[PDB]
Amino acid sequence: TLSIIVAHDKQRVIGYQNQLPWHLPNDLKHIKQLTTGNTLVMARKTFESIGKPLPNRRNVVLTNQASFHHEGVDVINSLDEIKELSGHVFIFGGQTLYEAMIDQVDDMYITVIDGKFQGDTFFPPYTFEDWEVESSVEGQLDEKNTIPHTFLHLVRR
Ligand SMILES: NC(=O)C1=CN([C@@H]2O[C@H](COP(=O)(O)OP(=O)(O)OC[C@H]3O[C@@H](n4cnc5c(N)ncnc54)[C@H](OP(=O)(O)O)[C@@H]3O)[C@@H](O)[C@H]2O)C=CC1
Ligand SMILES: COc1cc(Cc2cnc(N)nc2N)cc(OC)c1OC
């Protein structure tokens, strides 16, 4: 299975200055629940924003830099190599990768953030006729989670 996983606001902003605009712990928890034991493919600026591979899953970074190397990261250099990865693979961002892959993935796990944060990167448009909703549920809000958010799981039609 090849899956997108992303969080975006109502404007479909995902990022600003190579960081996430918002801090939403419940999104990070959701990330962890879905991806533990599986494989992440992240494009290079995303990897550099996060700064280190995430524990307890395989971290693959996509880059055209031949000398790119990092401890605990496998490196690929074209989108064709994504097909070759085994098991459940998550396209983990950023925009360049989401743009490239949205017409290729089997399904998408989207966290829709009920907010408007200014951004310099976006998640591509996606429509009702391409995607069917497998589930939609609202995240629980609390002292640490103050922005309303929906977890949406879409599967290609
Ligand atoms: N809200 C969310 O869920 C998420 C948001 N983000 C946000 O997204 C933004 C980053 O997105 P963006 O700026 O588009 O950068 P990306 O994270 O998409 O990284 C782009 C880099 O990836 C490499 N790359 C992309 N396509 C290819 C290819 N076909 N072959 C080889 N290398 C490739 C290149 O690296 P090189 O230059 O090394 O060749 C390129 O410069 C950040 O603000 C981040 O915070 C990221 C993940 C999730
Ligand atoms: C676990 O930490 C991060 C995770 C991500 C990617 C990401 C985050 N949330 C969702 N729902 N999908 C994604 N692909 C992006 C990040 O920064 C750009 C992170 O650092 C804060």
Is the distance from CB of 35 to CB of 6 less than 8 angstroms?
no
CA–CA distance, 82 with 11 (Å, rounded to integer): 28
CB atoms within 10 A of CB 11: 14
| Residue 30 token pair | 């959701």
Instruction: Report the separation in Å between the CA atom of 65 and the middle of ligand 2, taken as the mean of its atom positions.
Output: 22
Q: Is 5 assigned a ligand-binding role in the annotation? A: yes
Calculate the alpha carbon distances from 98 to 68, 138, 146 in Å. 21, 24, 27
Nearest residue CA, atom 6 of ligand 2? 92
Please state the three-class secondary structure of the chain as a single string: CEEEEEEEECCCEEEECCECCCCCHHHHHHHHHHHCCCEEEEEHHHHHHHCCCCCCCEEEEECCCCCCCCCCCEEECCCHHHHCCCCCEEECCCHHHHHHHCCCCCEEEEEEECCCCCCCEECCCCCCCCEEEEEEEECCCCCCCCCCEEEEEEEEC
Handedness of CA 59, 63, 69, 70 (dihedral sign): negative
Best mutation site among 64, 78, 104 for ligand 1 pocket (most ligand atoms within 8 Å of CB): 64
CATH 3.40.430.10 matches 1-157: yes
Domain-by-domain residue ranges, the chain?
Answer: 1-157
Token representation of residue 19 = 């960081």
Looking only at the bridges linking them, the beta strands covering 107-113 and 149-156 are antiparallel
